[PDB]
Design a protein around this ligand. Sequence first.
Ligand SMILES: Nc1ncnc2c1ncn2[C@@H]1O[C@H](COP(=O)(O)OP(=O)(O)OP(=O)(O)O)[C@@H](O)[C@H]1O
Ligand SMILES: Nc1ncnc2c1ncn2[C@@H]1O[C@H](COP(=O)(O)OP(=O)(O)OP(=O)(O)O)[C@@H](O)[C@H]1O
Ligand SMILES: Nc1ncnc2c1ncn2[C@@H]1O[C@H](COP(=O)(O)OP(=O)(O)OP(=O)(O)O)[C@@H](O)[C@H]1O
Ligand SMILES: [Mg+2]
Ligand SMILES: [Mg+2]
Ligand SMILES: [Mg+2]
Lengths: 181, 181, 181
Amino acid sequence: KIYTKNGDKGQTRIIGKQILYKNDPRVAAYGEVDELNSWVGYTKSLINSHTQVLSNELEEIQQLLFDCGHDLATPADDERHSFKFKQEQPTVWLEEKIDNYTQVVPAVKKFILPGGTQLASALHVARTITRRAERQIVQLMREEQINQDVLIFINRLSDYFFAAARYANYLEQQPDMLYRN
Amino acid sequence: KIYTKNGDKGQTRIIGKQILYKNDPRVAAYGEVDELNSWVGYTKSLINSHTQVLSNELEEIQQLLFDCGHDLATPADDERHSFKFKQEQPTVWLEEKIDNYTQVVPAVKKFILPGGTQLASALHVARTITRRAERQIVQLMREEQINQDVLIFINRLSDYFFAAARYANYLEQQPDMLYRN
Amino acid sequence: KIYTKNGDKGQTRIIGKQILYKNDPRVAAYGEVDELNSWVGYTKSLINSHTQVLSNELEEIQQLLFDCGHDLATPADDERHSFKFKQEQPTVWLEEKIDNYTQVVPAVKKFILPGGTQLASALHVARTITRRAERQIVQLMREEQINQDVLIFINRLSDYFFAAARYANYLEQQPDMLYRN
Ligand SMILES: Nc1ncnc2c1ncn2[C@@H]1O[C@H](COP(=O)(O)OP(=O)(O)OP(=O)(O)O)[C@@H](O)[C@H]1O
Ligand SMILES: Nc1ncnc2c1ncn2[C@@H]1O[C@H](COP(=O)(O)OP(=O)(O)OP(=O)(O)O)[C@@H](O)[C@H]1O
Ligand SMILES: Nc1ncnc2c1ncn2[C@@H]1O[C@H](COP(=O)(O)OP(=O)(O)OP(=O)(O)O)[C@@H](O)[C@H]1O
Ligand SMILES: [Mg+2]
Ligand SMILES: [Mg+2]
Ligand SMILES: [Mg+2]
């Protein structure tokens, strides 16, 4: 059975033997990353012929977020369990994409508001959910030692979603939504 | 008029006469369940011919979540108002569905990542929003006496969404997304 | 480049020179409004021929939310920077719409559950995300002086989404979902 009922009184296991309340900042950080992952899965379900080029990298992002969640669930001083996530190559990978997408899209002009195509709009939602997860990761960091690589990546990731959102609009010839002064 | 403006200074009524700030953990718990309910409504709007079998139980879940919200809004020591939600039959009902859906879907293999069809992806989002509500319910529980039946149900409910998500993928012959080691 | 990396250690700038941790209630309030804005962009991407009448006002709401976010990011005692958002005309504008939509839709009957058409369901999600942002705005208010006009507007805005959701259902001849006693 997938249900143990062990969590019925509001406590849960993390990586290692530690049992925490589900409102613990560590469990919250893990959960926000999990919710982001689910949103990314939802976003990739909206891909069409015009935007198929985005499918692979979204899948890779889900893989990377699973690793982020693992590390958030891992106490830094746990002898038996260690961090698995390293920021350097995934973050440089994001930066390459941010750079590429930023140059191909039209120069603006005004501040950009979230929206456009359904996919671009979803990528904008991904941006804001990433930022929500980031806040909770910072909450955890202020109480416990974390894998700081996760925070670097999650910071960069919301810029990725912004750039990818603009690019998704561009791919369907949809103008970005702009703030009118 | 649906607006009283009574809430314009950030306070609000619960069940009974009590007035709380909108950031009170009780109001937050109620609100997270309400947001879950809205997400379930959104999810059921995505049902197609292949997945029509899921419509009725999602509607029943919305009914049950309304009852959960009521009880979260009810102080335990309120003489005039009492809990209405009982976990036993709804939770056994969920468990029956979890069991059925778990056996019909393919055995894996790897850890499952959220995604697949738009409906399955939405059900995965429902899973994570349920867990977010659960954390806030636990926050409330740590400060105030709650209807513990609500927590049992909400715990089980996220397993329901996981199982139903896999089942929704299965119903459209879509493989579950898997974590690559 | 859109990424400075200045935020990689979990701190960020607001309006003016102040640097805050990303989990600061002010940054959280700003972020929740931003997430609402993205959800509104997503919602407006779902508009069809039957509901095109809702497009313009949703766009105006995104403009207004950008102004709300600005003011939430502005300390009240900052000499160099001031509040830009005034509630009176936008809120009266919402109230006019709430009144109109409330009278055209069928009288009920039972408590309304969120759902119906995909757009109506999305507008119901907008309602709950607005309320989530409202809670965080109240959290900030309890620690710092805020532009209280933002809170008035955000309070009213969730009633707008409720009314607009019902109206969106009505526009496609879809009955509201009702709670069965
Ligand atoms: N509400 C939640 N939010 C975020 N993370 C959670 C939540 N509940 C559990 N977790 C984390 O996700 C993992 C898997 O969740 P699961 O629901 O199986 O655990 P549980 O609730 O403790 O057990 P059960 O549901 O079987 O009673 C947990 O081991 C814990 O690390
Ligand atoms: N932001 C919120 N988040 C979660 N729950 C809320 C929120 N605001 C109100 N509630 C709860 O939902 C109920 C209905 O909300 P409603 O918006 O009508 O109340 P209000 O804001 O106090 O009044 P008004 O909007 O008429 O000024 C409230 O009585 C309260 O229990
Ligand atoms: N996680 C977050 N949640 C909500 N608001 C944020 C978050 N991060 C930054 N902000 C706010 O949004 C603005 C723009 O975000 P941005 O990501 O560019 O800032 P940063 O993270 O400090 O810098 P960088 O991403 O370049 O390292 C910030 O100046 C701050 O006001
Ligand atoms: Mg940043
Ligand atoms: Mg559980
Ligand atoms: Mg209100």
